[PDB]
Design a protein around this ligand. Sequence first.
Ligand SMILES: NC(=O)c1ccc[n+]([C@@H]2O[C@H](COP(=O)([O-])OP(=O)(O)OC[C@H]3O[C@@H](n4cnc5c(N)ncnc54)[C@H](OP(=O)(O)O)[C@@H]3O)[C@@H](O)[C@H]2O)c1
Ligand SMILES: NC(=O)c1ccc[n+]([C@@H]2O[C@H](COP(=O)([O-])OP(=O)(O)OC[C@H]3O[C@@H](n4cnc5c(N)ncnc54)[C@H](OP(=O)(O)O)[C@@H]3O)[C@@H](O)[C@H]2O)c1
Lengths: 182, 182
Amino acid sequence: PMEISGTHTEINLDNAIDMIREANSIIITPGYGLCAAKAQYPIADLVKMLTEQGKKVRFGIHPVAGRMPGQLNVLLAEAGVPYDIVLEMDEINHDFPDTDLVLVIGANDTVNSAAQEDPNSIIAGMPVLEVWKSKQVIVMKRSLGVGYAAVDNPIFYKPNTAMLLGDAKKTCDALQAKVRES
Amino acid sequence: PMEISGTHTEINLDNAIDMIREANSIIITPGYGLCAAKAQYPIADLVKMLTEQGKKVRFGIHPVAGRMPGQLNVLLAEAGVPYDIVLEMDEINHDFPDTDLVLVIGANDTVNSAAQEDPNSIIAGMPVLEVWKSKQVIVMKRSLGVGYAAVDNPIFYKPNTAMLLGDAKKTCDALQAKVRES
Ligand SMILES: NC(=O)c1ccc[n+]([C@@H]2O[C@H](COP(=O)([O-])OP(=O)(O)OC[C@H]3O[C@@H](n4cnc5c(N)ncnc54)[C@H](OP(=O)(O)O)[C@@H]3O)[C@@H](O)[C@H]2O)c1
Ligand SMILES: NC(=O)c1ccc[n+]([C@@H]2O[C@H](COP(=O)([O-])OP(=O)(O)OC[C@H]3O[C@@H](n4cnc5c(N)ncnc54)[C@H](OP(=O)(O)O)[C@@H]3O)[C@@H](O)[C@H]2O)c1
C-alpha cells in the first residue's frame, strides 16, 4: 500500500488584513478566478486605498492568465485600475524576491512552482509568476482545487503560503470593507 | 592613502589535473567565455568521466551568465549535461564554503567579489556566485582582463585562486583528453 500527504494553512479575514497592513510592497497576480467572480471592482477599490495609504501595490499579469490573451488587462482597466500599476510578467517577475506580500487571486497554473520544481510535470519549463519567492503569499480561491492544466500546485503547501478560501468577489468585497474601516 | 599588493598565480594543465584529481566536490561556474569558445562539448565529456570516478560535480549557473537568458542552460543541455547537476545560483551559492574546487570557465562578472568587497563598485550589492569561498578556485579565461561590466575582478588575486589561461575550448579539450588518458 501507499500514501502521501500535504499540509496547507488557512487564515481568516482578520489575519489577511493584518498581513496587508504590515506589508509595504504588494503584488497582485490575478487569474481566471478573478474573471469568473467578476472581482475586478472590489480589488481595484482596495488597491486604491492601500496606495493612498502609501503602500506600493502593483498587478503582475501572466501572458496567458485567464482564458483570452490580455483578458486581465481589459478587466482591470474596466475597473479603473491605473495602467501604470498593471505590469506584465516579464517586467515584474524579478521583483518577487523583494516583495513583502503577494495576493494570488483566482490564479493557479500561472503561479505554479511545479513548472520549475518538478522535472516530470506537464508544465515543466513553462514560464510562471514566481510568487513563492516573496515573503508571504496569500492564495485566494475557493479550494485547493486544480486549474485549467489539471495539476496540483506545490505553492499551496509552502511555509510562506496561506490560503484564504472563498469566492474571489466575496473575499475581495470583505477585504475592501474591512480596510475601509481603518 | 595606501597601496596594497596582489599576486596572481598562473598554472599549467598538469597542475589543474592534480587539483581536479584531488578534489571530492567540484562546482563549475560557466560564463560567456564558454559559449563564445563553444567549450560546452569538452566540458560535458569531462564532467561525465569525473562523475564516473566518484566525484560530485555540479554546475552553478548565474541568472545572467552569458549574453541571453538561460543561454548556459541551453548550451550545456545540448552538449548532454544532465539537468539534475545544473543548478541556479540561488540554490547552490550556500555550498561554496563546503566545496573543494570551483572551475570558473569563461565567467567573470558573475563571480566578481567586488560586488561584495567594494562599496563604490558599479556592481556593488549585485548577487554573484561566491566561488572564492571554496577551498580552491581555478579560473579559465584568456587573460586577467574584464568582462561585460568592464570592472576588475579581485578573485584573480586571492591566495586560493589559480589562473589557467587560454581559449576555453583549447583548454577544456586538453583537460578532457588528459583526464581520459587515466
Ligand atoms: N490566457 C489565455 O488566452 C488562455 C488560453 C487557453 C488556455 N489558457 C490556460 O488557462 C490557464 C490560466 O491560468 P490561471 O492562473 O488564470 O488559471 P487556472 O489555473 O485556470 O486558475 C483558475 C483558478 O481560479 C479558481 N476559481 C474559479 N472560480 C473562482 C471563483 N469564483 N473565486 C475564486 N477562485 C476561483 C480555481 O480554483 P478553485 O476551484 O479552488 O476556486 C482555479 O484553480 C493556463 O493554464 C492557460 O494556459 C489561457
Ligand atoms: N545573460 C543575459 O541575458 C545578459 C544580458 C545583458 C548583459 N549581460 C551581462 O553579461 C555578463 C555575463 O557574465 P559572465 O560571467 O558570463 O561574463 P563576462 O563577465 O562577460 O565574462 C566573459 C569572460 O570570458 C572570457 N572569454 C571570452 N572569450 C573567451 C574564450 N574564447 N576562452 C576563454 N575565455 C573567454 C573573457 O575574458 P578574457 O578576454 O580574459 O578571455 C571574459 O572576461 C554580466 O555582466 C551580465 O549582466 C547578460
